[PDB]
Design a protein around this ligand. Structure first.
Ligand SMILES: CC(C)C[C@H](CC(=O)NO)C(=O)N[C@H](C(=O)N[C@@H](C)C(=O)NCCN)C(C)(C)C
Ligand SMILES: [Zn+2]
Length: 255
């Protein structure tokens, strides 16, 4: 482990919805929430031994927090991840999650090329209980830690796949902080290279009396069970395949 290259620096973006609903129209409330959330997620990462031995101390730190206090004004037909209306259905509280991540990655491309990861924090009720999305760890899909260019034929420019998003709204209410911590952990988990834990591998998907599920389980975990705030051995194997190579590529020293 390289202590000079063990931290994935993050650009954290809070959109106007997150600012209004979670930050109560205040920057200090917005930033404190995000600073504490990343630090608790960092504790999970930093304490994980990816090889089940001494390969630990790998984590995350915020480089910058961008706070979008108001919606992004758009020209008719033009779209932006921070616009007032949801896309593609303006009548719905939320965007289609996949289109929102693509849009965020498009709009943040220049900034994203200079950071290990960009993560959007929003407050919108994604259809069917979805809480987040991220590139990487998907079973021709690519992305995750360290900017990787993708030429957008629609966008007509390179976008970077080092992105993810978390919503703190679900089924018409703010999720608990213990729940939000796990969304971000899961999404950054995909960014670090983990896929979802399968039911077919009991070691990676234990029963409730055996500590419950691990953070990469596809059905959301409310941190009440022992395993909820940990990575399965499946997640560790997947992340460990590339963690060191990615660390050499874009990770920095813990500030
Ligand atoms: C933190 C969780 C693990 C993230 C995943 C989404 C995901 O895998 N993105 O990486 C999620 O939102 N899962 C939902 C989920 O488990 N939501 C819970 C909160 C829920 O709404 N359950 C309601 C039962 N119908 C799905 C899409 C499975 C409904
Ligand atoms: Zn997932």
């Amino acid at each position: 482990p390289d202590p000079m290259k063990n931290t994935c620096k993050l650009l954290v973006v809070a959109d106007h919805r997150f600012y209004r609903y979670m930050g109560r129209g205040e920057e200090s409330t917005t930033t404190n929430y995000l600073i504490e959330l990343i630090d608790r997620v960092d504790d999970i990462y930093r304490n994980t031994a990816w090889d089940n031995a001494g390969f630990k101390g790998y984590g995350i730190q915020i480089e910058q927090i961008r706070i979008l206090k108001s919606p992004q004004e758009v020209k008719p037909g033009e779209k932006h991840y921070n616009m007032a209306k949801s896309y593609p259905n303006e009548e719905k509280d939320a965007w289609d999650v996949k289109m929102l991540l693509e849009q965020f990655s498009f709009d943040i491309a220049e900034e994203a090329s200079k950071v290990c990861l960009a993560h959007l924090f929003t407050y919108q009720d994604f259809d069917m209980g979805t809480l987040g999305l991220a590139y990487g760890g998907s079973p021709n899909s690519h992305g995750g830690v360290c900017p990787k260019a993708y030429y957008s034929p629609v966008g007509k420019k390179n976008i970077y796949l080092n992105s993810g998003l978390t919503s703190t709204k679900n089924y018409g209410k703010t999720i608990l902080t213990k729940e939000a911590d796990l969304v971000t952990t899961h999404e950054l988990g995909h960014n670090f290279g983990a896929e979802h834990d399968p039911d077919g591998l009991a070691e990676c998907a234990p029963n409730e009396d055996q500590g419950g599920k691990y953070v990469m389980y596809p059905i959301a975990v409310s941190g009440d069970h022992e395993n909820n705030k940990m990575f399965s051995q499946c997640s560790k194997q997947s992340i460990y395949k590339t963690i060191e190579s990615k660390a050499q590529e874009c990770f920095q020293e813990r500030s």
